[PDB]
Amino acid sequence: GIVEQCCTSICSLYQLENYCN
Amino acid sequence: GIVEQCCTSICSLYQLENYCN
Amino acid sequence: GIVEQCCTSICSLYQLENYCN
Amino acid sequence: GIVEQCCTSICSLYQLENYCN
Amino acid sequence: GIVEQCCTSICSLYQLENYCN
Amino acid sequence: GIVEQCCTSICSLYQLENYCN
Amino acid sequence: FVNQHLCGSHLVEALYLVCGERGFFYTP
Amino acid sequence: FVNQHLCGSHLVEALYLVCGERGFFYTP
Amino acid sequence: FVNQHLCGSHLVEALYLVCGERGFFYTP
Amino acid sequence: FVNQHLCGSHLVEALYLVCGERGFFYTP
Amino acid sequence: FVNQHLCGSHLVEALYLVCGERGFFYTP
Amino acid sequence: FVNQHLCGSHLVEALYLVCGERGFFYTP
Numbered sequence: 298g299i300v301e302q303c304c305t306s307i308c309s310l311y312q313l314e315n316y317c318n
Numbered sequence: 319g320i321v322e323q324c325c326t327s328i329c330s331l332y333q334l335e336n337y338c339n
Numbered sequence: 340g341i342v343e344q345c346c347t348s349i350c351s352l353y354q355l356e357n358y359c360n
Numbered sequence: 361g362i363v364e365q366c367c368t369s370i371c372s373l374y375q376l377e378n379y380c381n
Numbered sequence: 382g383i384v385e386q387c388c389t390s391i392c393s394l395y396q397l398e399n400y401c402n
Numbered sequence: 403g404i405v406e407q408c409c410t411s412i413c414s415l416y417q418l419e420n421y422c423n
Numbered sequence: 424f425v426n427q428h429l430c431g432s433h434l435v436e437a438l439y440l441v442c443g444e445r446g447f448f449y450t451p
Numbered sequence: 452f453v454n455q456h457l458c459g460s461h462l463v464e465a466l467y468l469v470c471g472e473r474g475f476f477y478t479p
Numbered sequence: 480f481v482n483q484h485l486c487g488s489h490l491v492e493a494l495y496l497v498c499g500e501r502g503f504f505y506t507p
Numbered sequence: 508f509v510n511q512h513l514c515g516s517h518l519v520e521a522l523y524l525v526c527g528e529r530g531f532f533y534t535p
Numbered sequence: 536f537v538n539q540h541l542c543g544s545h546l547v548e549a550l551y552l553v554c555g556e557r558g559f560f561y562t563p
Numbered sequence: 564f565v566n567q568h569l570c571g572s573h574l575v576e577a578l579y580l581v582c583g584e585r586g587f588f589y590t591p
């Protein structure tokens with residue numbers, strides 16, 4: 298999930314966008 | 319939505335809980 | 340205190356209420 | 361108090377120090 | 382930079398002021 | 403400046419990007 | 424619309440804390 | 452885990468900004 | 480009042496920063 | 508310690524939210 | 536003006552996110 | 564690199580408050 302993906306490596310804006318509706 | 323409900327008059331923790339999954 | 344209890348493991352809002360006045 | 365003084369006009373960090381312990 | 386200087390040991394307000402315009 | 407541009411109307415990501423180095 | 428934008432930021436932080444493990448839906 | 456808890460707080464703020472009017476679902 | 484609620488959130492953050500080890504009370 | 512410093516910032520925010528009108532002391 | 540002061544706080548967080556490794560200059 | 568990312572967010576907020584009218588330069 299988002300914590301696994303983005304809390305050990307920085308997520309880019311595009312990666313963060315993944316979690317938008 | 320939550321913005322309409324909660325951005326003029328303070329929503330309690332109880333009220334906010336309604337938006338949890 | 341609060342740092343030892345809550346910076347070392349997650350304290351919920353319920354648990355944090357114990358640190359209120 | 362702090363709301364009347366600082367939510368109605370900007371209080372600097374220097375000014376806010378007056379509300380510390 | 383500031384991240385290297387300030388993200389392990391706490392920078393004081395005085396230290397932070399060095400990065401103001 | 404940014405306050406004039408973005409505090410009376412919401413700035414988009416592109417508008418915010420204007421202020422990046 | 425900026426005031427609502429700022430409020431929303433605080434709302435999502437409050438929901439984060441209130442909802443904990445369950446998470447939440449932010450649908451504007 | 453507190454590190455993850457603090458990370459999550461920042462993630463929800465970032466999603467708020469990135470997602471705009473789309474909104475988002477937050478789940479840990 | 481939401482305006483006071485949001486103001487106070489930022490006030491607490493500022494007090495945390497400036498008050499250092501001495502700390503502060505938030506009361507209102 | 509920066510880790511404690513960042514933790515405390517989030518703790519104050521949570522206390523502000525949950526403590527309502529009663530408020531809180533932050534001391535550490 | 537407090538509204539602008541609170542707005543600015545959110546603007547700097549947004550710039551932090553949007554600008555990434557470029558960084559930014561903040562001036563009111 | 565996430566820890567530094569989170570720290571930076573707090574740094575920019577602190578600079579916002581410390582620097583006030585002057586603003587600041589965030590150059591990572």
Ligand SMILES: Oc1cccc(O)c1
Pocket residue numbers: 303304306307308309458461462465552565568
């Ligand atoms: O990977 C992350 C974690 C937290 C905030 C963010 O913008 C990115």
Ligand SMILES: Oc1cccc(O)c1
Pocket residue numbers: 324325327328329330430433434437481484524
């Ligand atoms: O009504 C609100 C608005 C923003 C934050 C909060 O905790 C409550």
Ligand SMILES: Oc1cccc(O)c1
Pocket residue numbers: 345346348349350351440453456514515517518521
């Ligand atoms: O255990 C914690 C630590 C920091 C913020 C919080 O809401 C809970």
Ligand SMILES: Oc1cccc(O)c1
Pocket residue numbers: 366367369370371372486487489490493537540580
């Ligand atoms: O006057 C104020 C109000 C809120 C936060 C702050 O730093 C100053």
Ligand SMILES: Oc1cccc(O)c1
Pocket residue numbers: 387388390391392393496509512570573574577
């Ligand atoms: O060294 C630091 C890091 C983050 C915030 C701050 O006020 C100081």
Ligand SMILES: Oc1cccc(O)c1
Pocket residue numbers: 408409411412413414425428468542545546549
């Ligand atoms: O116009 C604005 C004001 C504050 C934050 C933001 O993302 C946009």
Ligand SMILES: [Cl-]
Pocket residue numbers: 457458513514569570
């Ligand atoms: Cl953090």
Ligand SMILES: [Cl-]
Pocket residue numbers: 429430485486541542
């Ligand atoms: Cl605000």
Ligand code: NA
Pocket residue numbers: 314315316317318
């Ligand atoms: Na998606």
Ligand code: NA
Pocket residue numbers: 419420421422423
């Ligand atoms: Na630019």
Ligand SMILES: [Zn+2]
Pocket residue numbers: 457460461513516517569573
């Ligand atoms: Zn943080």
Ligand SMILES: [Zn+2]
Pocket residue numbers: 429433485488489541544545
């Ligand atoms: Zn705010």
